[PDB]
């Protein structure tokens, strides 16, 4: 297993302390009903613990030693990390192992960062953080603590593989929770929900739940699929949108701005809207199964195979009063 002791021990001592009234039970239960699990755990267990000599979290996620490591030592790490494929969120550069992930999560980062309130000093929740890539970038932009939640064992394992290789860094943590499970912590400075809203049956309740994690004057940063149109334009696909099951709402950005108004957010701004291109999302050596090219109408990339407008992503920023 993995021990969440460091985390509990950490939040025992800060403004997240009340979370201990629910978290350990929920994590215990999650660990209970987890029984290729061992492949993923051994990958983490068997990687060495290295303190990086150089650590860049400001412009990438890059770690290097003073003395470059043996060809064989790189290969051990390479092949253990290859055991945690598919790697979707990244990329990561760790002692010369370059994990070119399906997504250029960096692009999403470059398009979000400039519109943010200064992250320096902040405590942050990242809902649906995947591998945790963005959490490390949040550390680089000078956040005090970055906490993520994603109820997927693979991604908990990927994150722990990276932290281990980053010298067991304690400034970020991935809890295998789902966003439904949290109470109203009202303790985070900034909350990120990226690539999550459209997977929720109840989009307004998602926004309220996010709002319930924020201090007064906290900042929400919301990113999700979208469609062109006025306030009143909102697509709800059928069984498959870009081959994804369980897609619910894909509103227009203007519609999303209105939802946030309804859910009581303030100073809302559309900050980026960006067609997702096959150079932002694709097959790699570290993710071998289908990707965006396959989910697009082969004769018209402005549409999905099913025949819907193609993936488009907005970034909305907003403040809780
Ligand atoms: N109930 C849940 N609660 C919290 N997360 C969930 C839940 N269920 C599934 N997820 C997680 O939400 C993430 C959606 S991805 C965005 C990743 C990153 N944010 C990014 O912006 O690239 C896909 C995308 O939109 O590219 C996955 O990691 C799921 O495990």
Residue numbers in the entry: 1 to 35, 38 to 323
Kindly provide excerpts from the paper associated with this entry.
Cx-SAM is subsequently utilized in the CmoB-catalyzed carboxymethylation of ho5U-containing tRNAs to yield the mature cmo5U-modified tRNAs, with no involvement of a mo5U intermediate. As predicted from sequence considerations, CmoB is composed of a Rossmann fold, coupled to a substrate-specific N-terminal domain of ∼100 residues that is unique to CmoB. Our biochemical, genetic and structural data demonstrate that the primary in vivo function of CmoB is as a carboxymethyl transferase in the biosynthesis of cmo5U-modified tRNAs.
Cx-SAM bound CmoB structures were determined in two crystal forms, resulting in 10 independent copies of the complex (two tetramers in one crystal form, and one dimer in the other), while the apo structure contains a single dimer in the asymmetric unit. The dimers exhibit symmetry-related interactions that recapitulate the expected tetramer. Continued refinement and modeling indicated that Cx-SAM is present at full occupancy and demonstrated similar atomic interactions in all 10 independent catalytic sites in both liganded structures. The side chains of Lys-91, Tyr-200 and Arg-315 interact with the carboxyl group of the S-carboxymethyl moiety of the Cx-SAM ligand. Three additional conserved residues within the CmoB family recognize the amino acid moiety of the ligand: the side chain of Lys-110 (815/818) forms polar interactions with the α-carboxy group, while the backbone carbonyl oxygen atoms of Gly-130 (817/818; the presence of a bulkier side chain would likely interfere with ligand binding) and Met-196 (606/818, where other instances are leucine) interact with the α-amino group of Cx-SAM. The side chain of Glu-182 (96% conservation) forms polar interactions with N6 of the adenine moiety and the side chain of Asp-152 (∼97% conserved in CmoB orthologs, and highly conserved in all members for SAM-dependent methyltransferase superfamily) interacts with the 2′- and 3′-hydroxyls. The side chain of Thr-154 (only 29.9% conservation) also forms a hydrogen bond with the 2′-hydroxyl of Cx-SAM. The Cx-SAM binding site is more exposed to solvent than observed for the Cx-SAM/SAM binding sites in CmoA and many other SAM-dependent methyltransferases, likely due to the need to accommodate bulky tRNA substrates. Considerable positive electrostatic potential surrounds the Cx-SAM binding pocket on the surface of the CmoB, consistent with the docking site of polyanionic tRNA molecules. In all subunits in both Cx-SAM bound structures, a feature modeled as a phosphate ion is present between two basic residues, Arg-202 and His-208 (98.3 and 67.1% conservation, respectively), with one of the presumed sulfate ions from the crystallization media present at a similar position in the apo structure.
